[PDB]
User: Fold Lysozyme C from Gallus gallus.
Amino acid sequence: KVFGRCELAAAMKRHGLDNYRGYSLGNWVCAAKFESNFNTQATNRNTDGSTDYGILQINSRWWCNDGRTPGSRNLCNIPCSALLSSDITASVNCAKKIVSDGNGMNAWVAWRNRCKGTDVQAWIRGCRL
Ligand SMILES: [Cl-]
Ligand SMILES: [Cl-]
Ligand SMILES: [Cl-]
Ligand SMILES: [Cl-]
Ligand SMILES: [Cl-]
Ligand code: NA
Assistant:
């Protein structure tokens, strides 16, 4: 499923991401835009052989099991394919773990390079929230 911007914002807010660990909602929408273009089925292979999955491009090296990243962990205790669902529950619950781990949203390279330090509230402007 390819979400609309405000559709995704509302879904994220219902699932508790607004101001989660101090990150206002527009940070999360900005990160989803540049990680996956709001597409829950996005996948991208990394040079080490791990894969990024779903709307927030969560990496199989640490966070989910895809059966083909030897040596990796599964810290969100989920098959990576769950992160591709049209229901973003699994992606959000796993993101809450990632952002809690000490590096904050710097875990998402696109957030650091394209969202951090910008006017992120722009991403939720016009939405009924
Ligand atoms: Cl915001
Ligand atoms: Cl772009
Ligand atoms: Cl594996
Ligand atoms: Cl932080
Ligand atoms: Cl940009
Ligand atoms: Na893994």
